[PDB]
Design a protein around this nucleic acid. Structure first.
Lengths: 200, 122, 84, 113, 92, 130
RNA sequence: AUACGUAGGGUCCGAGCGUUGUCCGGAAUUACUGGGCGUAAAGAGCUCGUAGGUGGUUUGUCGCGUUGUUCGUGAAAACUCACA
RNA sequence: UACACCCUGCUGGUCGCAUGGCCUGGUAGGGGAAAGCUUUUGCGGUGUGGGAUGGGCCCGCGGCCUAUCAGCUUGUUGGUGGGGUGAUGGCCUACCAAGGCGACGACGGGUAGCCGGCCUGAGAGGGUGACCGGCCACACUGGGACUGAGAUACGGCCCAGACUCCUA
């Protein structure tokens, strides 16, 4: 369903920006706890586990929903590494986040929790919703007039909208065009390790 | 190796190498425990481990271990025996679940908190 | 066990009881034809075959014996006459 | 004898039906001799798609549609062909036209710019 | 319409017919015939070749021991005799 | 004595491996055509048949390039007695992933993987050399 | 005692989370794919030979094996592809 | 009354899978039925010819283990004529004859419903017959019979036991 913990501790443990601008994680880059300073018994096991945990904790996705992502990626005709990154870049909250309309992944998580978004005319309170190409996207007025959402929409100096997403008016219409391409995603650390580990 | 001789006979696996013998491959059975006398583990692992012999409902007489520190079971007890593997003891391949039919969970167990029948601390 | 169909019980008893006498009579006629044929008399055999080809055909038209059993018996008795 | 039947399919709340031809002594979901149509009360137009000439054959040899199956036949006008009393005509309604997959985004782009 | 309506021919035949060798032409109106098979093994691939002792009816007694004959199957003509000797082409 | 073609291939393997530049053989048409196609595709130098013990004999020259290196990579009868092997038009095996060549005694005669694939009949494959 | 037990403190999972029971693979640990038998498991003490398998060079036939082809054919769901 | 149909005697033509099949062959002899209610959308009855679908029988082939299970077999095999059956057929029965079955495993012991499938495995392979589907067997037990187009007739029956209940 949904996780509980914040992102700073996981950022420190996995040693990567999970908030994106976590002041406290770069304050304490070592893993949390009395022995984040203490050196770890290094293993490629740890490398792959850290990679998958970064992937899970970056987007707000959670483990059981993540495993079926790999499985369906492997079922896809293309190489599993490509398909997994494509589909993880194909989530409803991900689609609305990359448009710069949500300041956090948890922003979009709680937004789809509340029901502040609309795809093709149908309201989907389900973050696990899949948004296809050429989908019509809109934002409801009750959230539109809300003050922090007004800040998010009007101060949208956040990360730029990728070429496969297009906010095309004041209605926050994200007229999606194509799939998230490998040459266009600009993804964090790759996922070939996940494919090789899960395939065994 | 003489393909025709294969047609004559051959190609069987070696041996099942069975593990569980309570009955029915039961995820657990229940029965009456007795002979709860403590015996000795292996010499390098010098200690003493509390065990018992349980006649399960499966009509077989097996040897079960009593995990944890404290025990609640005594003679004529409805103990639930599960399969186990104790290399520390000779011929002991069973345990009794704590926080279950008869044996109360191990007192104040907190590192496991699911095993040893230690319920949630309020 | 009794359920709203003892009427079927009585109906079937009646239906299987009439056929008892019907079959006894037809079998007695057939055995009589047998003594006619074995005795070597052809006129009596011809008349008994005629009568039985009437009788068993009637019984087959009625609900006593399947159509083809009657044809089988008719042919058998007809040949028994034809050769005596 | 022989009857043309409606058999149930789909998940719980939304019913669907296949128009089959089968013996009465079977169950609702036995071996269909031939699937000759399909119908769904759940969908808007109760849309029906029927193999026509096979139904014509089976009516000829003496297939006896079930009461709602016969109703569906009339809803098609198929019963107006084997019986042919007024002649066969399109009697069933249809799903509304509805836009396409591409024209939706075409209109969205036109509205946007 | 006509009082009599006709029927069909139900194209019929192809009763199993095979070449065998008469081997036990011993009992009255009775022969025993054998057949050959050559079948790839399901698992290994060693094509095994086996036989079968069918019992055939010879109303004429034409056959004899070790004759290359042909047989078509019939209706069951007795308890284990279901073959008709036709198209005889070798004796001895 | 049970298998002549396996002994054919075994002699080719030993003679080429033991650096001999020639090998002599009784001339049964089978091995004759085997070595014929062998030189056809060029894993050997040249074969010539002459007269010998009551039959005839085929003498095979193995193709060696700038050094004592054999164009033959190896030989192995597959459809051996007791394990005779048949194949069809579709699943025609590709030798060395397709690099090498094979022998497939088609109903239309003798063909390799590529030839039978271009044509499409099967029934009996034999050794392959790469 | 970082292995026990206890605390933090960390890993991970989450209305789940672990334990027991069973099956497959990993096992090539039945080796058809894909094993071996001097010293590690494995050539009977040695002969012949029934059954069986098994085959020299070459001529013609048959096309059973074998392959090529057309069609009937293999319910639906199966499972997958594609659409809703 | 039927001849549309069946049985027999003869016989013409025709296709053959040998028994035989087709011409409602013909011929001649013989034989074989039925229904009322109801006005009421009318429902209904008999016989035959055909459809349709449901079936019944036989066969090719596929799919447990175990000689510390190698002989088994007399209604078993074949024929004959009959009884019987919807039809064939030791199905049964009188006679005749002695065959027939197996190391390509009979006959025995144990074991098990089976398949579309499902799951593992890269594949082969392996394990299962949950549920959803396809058939079969079975409905206190064991014997027997019935009817109907159709019966191991689960909520049909009788008989021999068990068990239980009521009991003058």
């Amino acid at each position: 369903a949904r996780y509980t913990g914040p992102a700073t501790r996981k950022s420190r443990r996995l040693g990567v920006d999970l908030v994106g601008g976590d002041q406290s994680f770069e304050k304490r880059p070592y893993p949390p706890g009395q022995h984040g300073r203490a050196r770890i018994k290094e293993s490629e096991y740890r490398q792959q586990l850290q990679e998958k945990q970064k992937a899970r904790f970056s987007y707000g996705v959670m483990e059981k929903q993540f495993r079926r992502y790999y499985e369906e990626a492997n079922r896809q005709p293309g190489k599993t590494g490509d398909n997994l990154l494509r589909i993880l870049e194909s989530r409803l909250d991900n689609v609305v986040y990359r448009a710069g309309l949500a300041r956090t992944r948890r922003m979009a998580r709680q937004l789809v929790s509340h029901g502040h978004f609309l795809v093709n005319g149908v309201k989907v309170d389900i973050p696990s919703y899949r948004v296809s190409q050429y989908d019509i996207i809109d934002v409801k007025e009750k959230s539109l007039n809300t003050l922090p959402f007004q800040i998010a929409r009007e101060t949208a100096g956040e990360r730029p909208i990728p070429s496969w997403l297009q906010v095309v008016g004041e209605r926050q219409r994200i007229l999606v065009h194509q799939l998230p391409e490998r040459a266009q995603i600009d993804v964090p650390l790759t996922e070939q390790l996940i494919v090789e580990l899960y395939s065994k | 190796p003489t393909i025709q001789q294969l047609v004559r006979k051959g190609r069987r696996d070696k041996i099942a190498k069975v593990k569980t013998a309570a009955l029915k491959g039961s995820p657990q059975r229940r029965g009456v425990c007795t002979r709860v006398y403590t015996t000795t583990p292996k010499k390098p692992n010098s200690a003493l481990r509390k065990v018992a012999r349980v006649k399960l409902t499966s009509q077989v007489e097996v040897t079960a271990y009593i995990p944890g520190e404290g025990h609640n079971l005594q003679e004529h007890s409805m103990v639930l025996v599960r399969g186990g593997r104790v290399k520390d003891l000779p011929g002991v391949r069973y345990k009794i679940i704590r926080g279950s039919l008869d044996t109360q969970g191990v007192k104040n167990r907190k590192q496991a908190r699911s095993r040893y029948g230690a319920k949630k601390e309020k | 066990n009794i359920k709203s169909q003892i009427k079927r019980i009585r109906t079937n008893e009646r239906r299987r009881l009439r056929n008892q006498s019907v079959k006894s009579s037809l079998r007695t006629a057939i055995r009589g034809f047998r003594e006619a044929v074995d005795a070597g008399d052809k006129d009596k055999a011809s008349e008994l075959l005629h009568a039985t080809s009437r009788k068993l055909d009637k019984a087959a038209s009625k609900g006593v014996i399947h159509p083809n059993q009657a044809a089988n018996k008719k042919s058998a008795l007809a040949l028994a006459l034809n050769k005596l | 004898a022989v009857k043309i039947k409606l058999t149930r399919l789909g998940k719980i709340r939304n019913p669907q039906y296949r128009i089959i031809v089968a013996d009465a002594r079977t169950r609702r979901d036995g071996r269909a001799i031939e699937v000759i149509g399909r119908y769904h009360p759940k969908e808007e137009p109760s849309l029906i798609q029927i193999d026509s000439e096979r139904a014509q054959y089976w009516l000829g040899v003496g297939a006896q549609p079930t009461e709602p199956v016969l109703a569906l036949l009339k809803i098609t006008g198929d019963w107006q062909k084997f019986k042919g009393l007024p002649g066969a005509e399109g009697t069933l309604k249809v799903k509304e036209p509805k836009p396409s997959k591409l024209d939706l985004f075409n209109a969205a782009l036109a509205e946007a710019e | 319409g006509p009082k009599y309506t006709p029927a069909a021919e139900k194209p019929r035949g192809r009763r199993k017919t095979a070449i065998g060798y008469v081997v036990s032409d011993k009992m009255q109106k009775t022969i025993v015939v054998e057949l050959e098979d050559r079948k790839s093994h399901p698992l290994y691939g060693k094509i095994i070749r086996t036989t079968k002792k069918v019992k055939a009816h010879d109303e004429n007694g034409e056959a004899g021991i070790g004759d290359r004959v042909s047989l078509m199957e019939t209706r069951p003509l007795s308890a284990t005799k279901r073959w008709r000797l036709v198209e005889i082409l070798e004796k001895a | 004595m049970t298998d002549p073609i396996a002994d054919f291939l075994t002699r080719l393997r030993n003679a080429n491996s033991a650096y001999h530049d020639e090998v002599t053989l009784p001339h049964s048409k089978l091995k004759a055509n085997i070595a014929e196609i062998l030189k056809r595709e060029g894993y050997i130098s040249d074969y010539r048949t002459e007269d010998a013990r009551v039959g005839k004999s085929l003498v095979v020259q193995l193709k060696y390039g700038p050094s004592r290196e054999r164009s033959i990579a190896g030989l192995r009868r597959v459809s051996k007695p007791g394990l005779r092997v048949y194949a069809k038009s579709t699943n025609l095996p590709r030798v060395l992933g397709g690099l090498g060549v094979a022998i497939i005694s088609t109903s239309s005669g003798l063909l390799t993987d590529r030839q039978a694939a271009r044509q499409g009949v099967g029934g009996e494959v034999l050794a392959y050399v790469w």
